[PDB]
């Protein structure tokens, strides 16, 4: 039954025919009869592991979305965990087109938590395939730009609590900021008000020179960011360095070095182009 | 800040000095030190406001040595801008 | 990126030919998708006080259409409009009064000083702006 439904969905996705619409309706009726989240998740997995790599579909995609909605109607935390694990295991072609097609707020929160955990695992393992999977998950989260500021705030608060894995989480957040075009910029600038600077300094005390290079790269990337309110970020950077408003002298020295590096990076962005190309937008 | 102790930072310092300098002998010092420390980087595509006429840009990119290309290009561009 | 070469031509323009040709191009491509005039504010300010009549009319019409897209920028073209109202070219003032009531509606916060300067220019300088300022008054209520 499930194999025939998967074959019909793959045939409908490859050849745009209506011969699998009645089969999809029968499968959708049978799924509400069983009322199993795990079975619907497994049915959506067979229709996206290899049935979504050939060609895009409409009726098969609708059937997969209905199965995913039926699975996500209940809680299904363990079902969501196995759905996220099989999707990251089979990240071939349109894996993100099926993973992020749920468009549910609780589903978006669970997918963001799974993507954050996958990025943490990728940063800890330092694997190229794991890093590519984390980048794909970040790109999938970027297209579903509904509400990720609370997730980013929770990730940043969790990162500042630790000191050992804080450097890896910070590097993973800096990389997604280079990937996702710095969606939560002003909220991040508002967050490091009074105590987060000391916690970040304590975390960076356990880092290495690779942490210093990553911080320089993150400063250069955040230089070409914050299009909404960059005056607040500039004033926060200026007062934390020369005005000695920071709680640590080493933090003030690091902020001064970051300001100097930002000026140096801004100089190459504005000056070094050569001849008449299209200009670089900052 | 004195003693930068960094390659990219020193690149930036010598670039900002190169953009600001008008004295040709000082510019020669910046160019020779900048080509000495770097390996194979062409340093004429370093300030987009420098402009050379099209036929003169065609003939001026024909010198073989990198130091002479960069020097004569940026000095003649600076001379045209000063005029 | 799509607007960089036209505005490079507009900024580095010396002859009336280049300015008029670029103004015709930008008028043609601003008839549709008219939100592209926000980038042409400072150059339109500078070219609005130009002495040639055709390019000045094109700049004035483009500035009024740019108000028509978003009237929040009308407080930024005020010094140039005040300069055109009180210059000594005797054609910038007439083109300013020809476009006076539309900008008088489109500003609505500094209309008093605009119409005040209109009265003094038409009063101390011998010319008759009474119809335009009075029409702006009637449709201003």
**DSSP string across B30-75:** HHHHHHHHSSS---STT-TT----HHHHHHHTT-SSHHHHHHHHHH
Contact B44/B73 with Cβ under 8 angstroms? yes
Alpha-carbon distance values, A64 to A78, A81, B75 (Å): 19, 18, 66
**Measured between CB atoms, does A143 come within 8 Å of chain B?**
no
- H or E element: which one contains C99? none
Neighbours of C131 (CB within 10 A): 10
Long-range own/partner contacts, residues C132-137 (CB < 8 A, 24 or more apart): C132/C97, C132/C98, C132/C100, C132/C101, C133/C100, C133/C101, C135/C101, C136/C100, C136/C101, C136/C104, C136/C105, C136/C111
Whether there are 3 or more C-beta pairs closer than 8 Å between C and B is no
Q: Resolution for this model in angstroms, one decimal place? A: 4.1
- Cα A61 off chain centre by: 23
Nearby residues of C81 by Cβ (< 8 Å), 6 or more positions away: C48, C96, C103, C114
Q: In which residue are the tokens 């030190």 written?
A: B33
Task: Count interface pairs A-C at CB distance under 8 A.
Answer: 6
Alpha-carbon span C44 to C37, nearest angstrom: 9
- Judged by CB atoms closer than 8 Å, whether chains meet at B45 and A274 is answered as yes
**Quick one: CA dihedral A191, A196, A201, A202, positive or negative?**
negative
Neighbours of C113 (CB within 10 A): 13
Neighbours of A231 (CB within 10 A): 8
Q: In which residue are the tokens 């897209």 written?
A: C69
- Cα C122 off chain centre by: 19
**Measured between CB atoms, does A275 come within 8 Å of chain C?**
no
Cα A134–A186–C73 angle (5° rounding)?
Answer: 125
List chain C residues with CB under 8 Å of A279.
1, 4
Alpha-carbon distance C7 to nearest alpha carbon in chain A (angstroms): 12
Alpha-carbon span A177 to A183, nearest angstrom: 8
Q: In which residue are the tokens 């019409």 written?
A: C61
Contact A209/A161 with Cβ under 8 angstroms? no
Alpha-carbon distance values, A233 to A155, A213, A219, A226 (Å): 20, 21, 12, 8
Contact A162/A123 with Cβ under 8 angstroms? no
Among A252, A274, A277, A282, most B C-beta atoms within 10 A, so best to mutate, is A274
- Cα C11 off chain centre by: 17
Cα A257–A119–A266 angle (5° rounding)?
Answer: 30
Query: Which of C113, C102, C101, C97 lies closest to C66 in space, CA to CA?
Result: C102
List chain A residues with CB under 8 Å of C2.
none
List chain B residues with CB under 8 Å of A271.
15, 19, 46-49
Contact A89/A118 with Cβ under 8 angstroms? no
List chain C residues with CB under 8 Å of A281.
1
Query: Which of A43, A48, A52 lies closest to A24 in space, CA to CA?
Result: A43
Alpha-carbon distance C6 to nearest alpha carbon in chain A (angstroms): 12
**Measured between CB atoms, does A164 come within 8 Å of chain B?**
no
Experimental approach taken: cryo-EM
Q: Which string of b and e fits A156-194 if b means at least 16 CB within 10 Å?
A: beebbeeeebbbbbbbbbbbbbbbbebbbbbebbeeeee
Alpha-carbon distance values, A28 to A60, A72, C81 (Å): 11, 14, 67
């Amino acid at each position: 039954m499930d194999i025939y439904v998967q074959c019909l969905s793959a045939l409908i996705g490859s050849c745009p025919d209506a011969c699998v619409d009645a089969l999809l309706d029968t499968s959708v009726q049978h799924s509400p009869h069983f009322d199993w989240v795990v079975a619907h998740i497994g049915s959506s997995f067979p229709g996206t592991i290899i049935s979504r790599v050939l060609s895009c579909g409409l009726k098969d995609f609708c059937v997969h979305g209905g199965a995913g909605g039926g699975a996500g109607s209940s809680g299904g935390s363990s079902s969501q965990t196995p759905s996220t694990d099989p999707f990251p295991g089979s990240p071939a072609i349109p894996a993100e087109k099926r993973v992020p097609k749920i468009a549910s707020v609780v589903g978006i929160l669970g997918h963001l938590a799974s993507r954050h955990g996958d990025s943490i695992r990728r940063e800890l393992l330092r694997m190229f395939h794991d890093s590519l999977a984390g980048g794909s998950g970040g790109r999938s989260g970027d297209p579903s730009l509904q509400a990720t500021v609370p997730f980013l705030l929770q990730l940043a608060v969790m990162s500042p609590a630790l000191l050992g894995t804080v450097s890896g989480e910070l590097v993973d957040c800096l990389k997604p900021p280079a990937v996702l075009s710095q969606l939560q910029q002003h909220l991040q600038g508002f967050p490091r008000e009074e105590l987060d600077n000391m916690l970040n300094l304590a975390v960076h005390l356990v880092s290495q020179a690779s942490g210093a290079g990553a911080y320089r790269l993150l400063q250069f990337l955040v230089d070409t960011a914050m299009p909404a309110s960059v005056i607040t970020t500039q004033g926060l950077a200026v007062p934390d360095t020369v005005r000695e408003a920071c709680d640590r002298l080493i933090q003030l020295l690091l902020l001064h070095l970051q300001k100097l590096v930002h000026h140096r990076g801004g100089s190459p962005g504005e000056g070094v182009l050569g001849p008449p190309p299209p200009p670089r937008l900052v | 800040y004195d003693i930068p102790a960094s390659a990219s930072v020193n690149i930036g310092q010598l670039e900002h000095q190169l953009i600001l300098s008008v004295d040709p002998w000082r510019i020669r010092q910046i160019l020779i030190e900048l080509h000495g420390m770097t390996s194979e980087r062409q340093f004429w595509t370093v300030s987009n406001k420098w402009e050379v006429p099209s036929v003169y840009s065609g003939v001026i990119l024909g010198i073989k040595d990198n130091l002479t290309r960069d020097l004569v290009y940026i000095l003649m561009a600076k001379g045209l801008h000063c005029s | 990126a799509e607007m960089a070469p036209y505005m490079k031509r507009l900024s580095r323009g010396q002859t009336v030919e280049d300015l008029l040709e670029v103004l015709s191009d930008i008028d043609e491509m601003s008839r549709r998708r008219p939100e592209i005039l926000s980038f042409f504010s400072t150059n339109l300010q500078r070219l609005m006080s130009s002495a040639e009549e055709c390019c000045r009319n094109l700049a004035f019409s483009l500035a009024l259409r740019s108000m028509q897209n978003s009237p929040s920028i009308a407080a930024a073209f005020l010094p140039t409009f005040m300069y055109c109202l009180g210059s000594q070219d005797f054609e910038v003032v007439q083109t300013a009064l020809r476009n006076l009531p539309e900008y008088a509606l489109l500003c609505q916060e500094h209309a008093a000083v605009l119409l005040h300067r209109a009265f003094l220019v038409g009063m101390y300088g011998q010319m008759d702006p009474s119809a335009q300022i009075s029409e702006a008054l009637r449709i201003l209520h």
